[PDB]
Amino acid sequence: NLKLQLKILSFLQFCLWGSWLTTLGSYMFVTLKFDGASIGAVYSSLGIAAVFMPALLGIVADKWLSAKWVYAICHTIGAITLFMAAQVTTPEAMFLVILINSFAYMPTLGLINTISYYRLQNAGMDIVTDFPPIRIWGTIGFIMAMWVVSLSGFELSHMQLYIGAALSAILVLFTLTLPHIPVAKQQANQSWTTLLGLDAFALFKNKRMAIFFIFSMLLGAELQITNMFGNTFLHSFDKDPMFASSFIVQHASIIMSISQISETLFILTIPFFLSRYGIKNVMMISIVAWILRFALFAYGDPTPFGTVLLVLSMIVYGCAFAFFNISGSVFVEKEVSPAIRASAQGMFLMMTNGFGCILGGIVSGKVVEMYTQNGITDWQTVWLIFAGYSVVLAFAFMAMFK
């Protein structure tokens, strides 16, 4: 069954990532005794890879090498590195090993779409109707991988990495049975600057756009903070005997999953929310939701009420994370010359998830380290300065959109 092939590819593509993505901070901190700086600069590598590797590898997919074979090469490298990473004991090595893995992994995020699109389109189907049910298994792979590694007792354990590599290899084997995905050669007459998304640098001529993009970087910096240290913040409550055995202490990935759960459901309510309140309002709902998220983490407790607040934060996360990115790219498209409109979202997403990522990763790790003393982190204060930077972002955005 073709559909089933694509669904296994989606599942695996994301299972291998979820097995370690959210927990790796904790494993660096609780087990490897890493400070916040080293962790934040290890998760920064995602951004370094993301800013330019997707572009170039999609380029080669389009001109010299089947997307199938390029995807294969990537996850192979992903697998080898994930294995080595479970044998890495120092931060510089963790950063270098993760950086390679991301340089290989980041491009696959579009390569699987290239592949799934052609697979359905060369088979009398339209993506708008038959892709969403194939893209829900990538979300299942992710949330279940979180569930599994949590429940197997491998959260704080280097095992998560062995499992991710194991999925990556299983993956590579599965993508060998793929059918020949031709070199699309759609980009051919495309100017050399057009392919890398270099037009949109000129687009900084528009003062309003320039303002928007740097805002998008500043806002994007806090996008993954919860995903980088939320599991470490929930494991922080080891230090009390009362919370030691608490389920949300024991299995943080299980509580954090509600974050991904709510992101999926809220991505579903994005179109309607746009129709009812507009681009700028939906982006504002995102910026305000980040405040609430970090505020609820700041008073979160394994206690009954503290857990209530913690779960509330999870729910708020989904709107917070989905809304800004969807309404942002819609805003950019609506606001720019149609000819260059796509380079707009190229540069928007690059600024927001690459540069936003590098800057956020590094700075937040440093905030943690600055408020980590004797090996114990004052999470309440950490989350307050993050909720307060959310507030500054709210204020400045209110200025721009009144």
mmCIF file of C-alpha atoms in Angstrom, residues 52-74 103-104 107-108 111 114 181-187 195-196:
data_model
loop_
_atom_site.group_PDB
_atom_site.id
_atom_site.type_symbol
_atom_site.label_atom_id
_atom_site.label_comp_id
_atom_site.label_asym_id
_atom_site.label_seq_id
_atom_site.Cartn_x
_atom_site.Cartn_y
_atom_site.Cartn_z
ATOM 1 C CA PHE A 52 21.853 26.864 5.111
ATOM 2 C CA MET A 53 21.824 23.044 4.828
ATOM 3 C CA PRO A 54 18.127 22.642 3.892
ATOM 4 C CA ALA A 55 18.502 25.113 0.969
ATOM 5 C CA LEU A 56 21.618 23.456 -0.504
ATOM 6 C CA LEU A 57 20.475 19.867 -0.111
ATOM 7 C CA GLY A 58 17.131 20.672 -1.697
ATOM 8 C CA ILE A 59 19.189 22.223 -4.488
ATOM 9 C CA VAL A 60 21.119 19.010 -5.109
ATOM 10 C CA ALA A 61 17.848 17.052 -4.890
ATOM 11 C CA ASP A 62 16.512 19.291 -7.665
ATOM 12 C CA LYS A 63 19.539 19.126 -9.963
ATOM 13 C CA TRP A 64 22.032 16.228 -9.517
ATOM 14 C CA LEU A 65 20.817 13.398 -7.265
ATOM 15 C CA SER A 66 17.482 11.743 -6.644
ATOM 16 C CA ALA A 67 15.791 12.935 -3.474
ATOM 17 C CA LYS A 68 15.616 9.253 -2.471
ATOM 18 C CA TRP A 69 19.372 8.815 -2.544
ATOM 19 C CA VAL A 70 20.066 12.176 -0.860
ATOM 20 C CA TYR A 71 17.583 11.363 1.956
ATOM 21 C CA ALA A 72 19.250 7.960 2.348
ATOM 22 C CA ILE A 73 22.739 9.433 2.651
ATOM 23 C CA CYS A 74 21.445 11.871 5.247
ATOM 24 C CA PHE A 103 23.647 19.051 9.132
ATOM 25 C CA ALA A 104 22.436 15.666 7.899
ATOM 26 C CA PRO A 107 17.606 18.810 5.088
ATOM 27 C CA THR A 108 15.585 15.585 5.376
ATOM 28 C CA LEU A 111 13.406 15.865 1.403
ATOM 29 C CA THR A 114 9.660 16.278 -1.932
ATOM 30 C CA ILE A 181 12.145 9.733 -7.312
ATOM 31 C CA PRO A 182 13.479 11.562 -10.389
ATOM 32 C CA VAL A 183 15.551 14.678 -10.161
ATOM 33 C CA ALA A 184 12.701 17.180 -10.399
ATOM 34 C CA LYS A 185 14.676 19.773 -12.417
ATOM 35 C CA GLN A 186 11.926 22.314 -11.733
ATOM 36 C CA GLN A 187 14.550 24.876 -10.682
ATOM 37 C CA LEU A 195 17.866 29.100 -5.245
ATOM 38 C CA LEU A 196 19.613 29.952 -1.897
#
